[PDB]
């Protein structure tokens, strides 16, 4: 029972080189939190059908509590011969097991409010919604930052609320994932996690951000002026990007106060007839991005203390060093596994920051603004290839009120991405998992608006 579990650890162990390969090693076997989460994800969890998913799903999960129950129990029989690196972090194991519930129970289960809300915040044309509260495209964006870093980020408002420009940069593994590296002390403790972009351009963490900081640093043009994109010749190694928030509030160095917030998701619930409890959008969370202990963080993670590994934990089951499995559910992708993308002539007239900074003495600049300039290119990218479908459904956003949209280029960029589906009944773009069956569907999907 145990053994048929436990031996498949022993043999990944020799076929990973992280033992010698001649029996149960009793002394000399290494096992960890890390080693036995790295061992499920290269096996079980990356397995890359309707009744059959399901089935094979519950199955995963059992076996997934089966195999930690056995290699606990491999543990204490290691222990009884003396071996002194078999202790078992177990409370990282139920996290594990209980992120694996989550996601098969709510695949099980099957609108998530992560959909409802976003669509309804995107939309610029929302009159029964707070014309004290929401006014601006700009103020209902700033508010989907917040909720979309809760929704992805299992963050309490306090948390989110510390985030500042210079926390985020793009991974080195995944260049598509934004890395908050979280450093805490009391021994030092390390938390990463990761924003993904969503297929689903209302829904992409990525766009809604890249937009709120458009507005943000931009205005509208023949309406408001913006804050302007961040002084980059004034940061000295993140003095200046560690002060300046995610989100800004009242004043440009200040993150919205938690009171103003509080009343800002009553509103948005009672507008989309979501139930609300404040506690589950503003208190700390029961699943999280795991937190790990500075020896362990150094010391697994570095691939020159282990030369003899076959595959080191970075390649594939901790890209970026964040366990493959926490950053797919976390962002709604499963673990078990751009046709038109946008002309150069076009990347250039939004941001344009970012290339001046460029062609300069980028090299003078420190390396947290060069980190924050190719972080805010890859959301400039995202921004720009998915404003063809926000065109479609809001084409009086607050952002295309810069009389550039209306040129001959973008609008030829924006009919080329969309017309080859402007006559199916079907959405481009896909959902979420266990959703696209129901909401890539055109009438189904734009149901999701309260108005319009």
């Known amino acids: 029972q145990y053994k048929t579990y436990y031996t498949k650890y022993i043999q990944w162990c020799q076929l990973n ?29 990356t397995d890359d059908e309707d009744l059959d998913e399901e089935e094979e799903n519950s199955f995963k999960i059992a076996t997934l509590k089966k195999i930690i129950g056995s290699l606990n129990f491999l543990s204490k029989l290691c222990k009884v011969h003396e071996n002194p690196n078999a202790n078992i972090d177990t409370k990282y194991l139920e996290s594990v097991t209980k992120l694996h519930t989550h996601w098969i129970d709510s695949q099980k289960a099957i609108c998530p409010p992560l959909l409802k809300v976003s669509l309804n915040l995107w939309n610029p044309e929302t009159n029964h919604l707070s014309e004290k509260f929401f006014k601006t495209c700009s103020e209902k964006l700033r508010f989907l930052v917040d909720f979309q870093l809760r929704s992805y980020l299992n963050l309490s408002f306090e948390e989110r609320s510390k985030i500042r420009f210079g926390s985020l940069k793009l991974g080195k593994r995944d260049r598509d994932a934004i890395i908050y590296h979280k450093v805490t002390h009391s021994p030092g403790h390390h938390q990463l996690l990761a924003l993904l972009p969503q297929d689903c351009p209302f829904i992409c963490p990525q766009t809604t951000l890249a937009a709120y900081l458009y507005l943000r640093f931009y205005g509208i043009p023949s309406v408001s002026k913006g804050d302007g994109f961040p002084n980059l010749n004034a940061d000295e190694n993140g003095s200046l990007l560690q002060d300046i928030p995610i ?14 917030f509080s009343n800002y998701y009553t509103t948005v619930f009672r507008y989309c007839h979501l139930p609300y409890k404040r506690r589950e959008y503003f208190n700390k969370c029961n699943l999280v991005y795991p937190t790990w202990d500075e020896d362990t963080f150094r010391t697994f993670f570095n691939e020159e203390n282990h030369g003899n590994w076959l595959e080191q934990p970075e390649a594939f089951a901790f890209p970026d ?33 970012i290339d001046e900074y460029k ?13 924050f300039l190719d972080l805010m290119e890859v959301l400039r990218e995202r921004f720009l290839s998915n404003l063809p479908w926000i065109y479609k459904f809001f084409p009086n956003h607050d952002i295309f009120q810069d009389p550039i949209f209306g040129n001959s280029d ?43």
Do not use: C
Not at 247 to 260: A, D, I, Q
Not at 326 to 345: E, H
Not at 359 to 368: A, F, K, P
């Open 17 to 45: 080189q992280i033992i010698p390969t001649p029996s149960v090693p009793y002394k000399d076997l290494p096992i960890s939190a890390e080693l036995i989460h790295w061992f499920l994800l290269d096996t079980l969890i």
């Open 247 to 260: 989100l800004r509030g009242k004043s440009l160095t200040t993150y919205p106060r938690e009171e103003t």
């Open 410 to 452: 973008f609008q030829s960029y924006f009919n080329d991405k969309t017309i080859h589906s402007k006559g199916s009944p079907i959405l481009s773009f896909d959902i979420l998992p266990g959703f696209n069956k129901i909401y890539k569907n055109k009438t189904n999907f734009y149901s999701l608006l309260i108005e319009r």
């Open 359 to 371: 062609r300069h003495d980028y090299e003078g600049l420190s390396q947290n603004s060069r980190d």
């Open 321 to 353: 060093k964040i366990p493959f499995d926490f950053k797919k559910i976390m962002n709604f992708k499963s673990p078990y596994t751009d046709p038109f993308p946008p002309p150069k002539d076009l990347l250039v007239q939004i941001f344009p920051e």
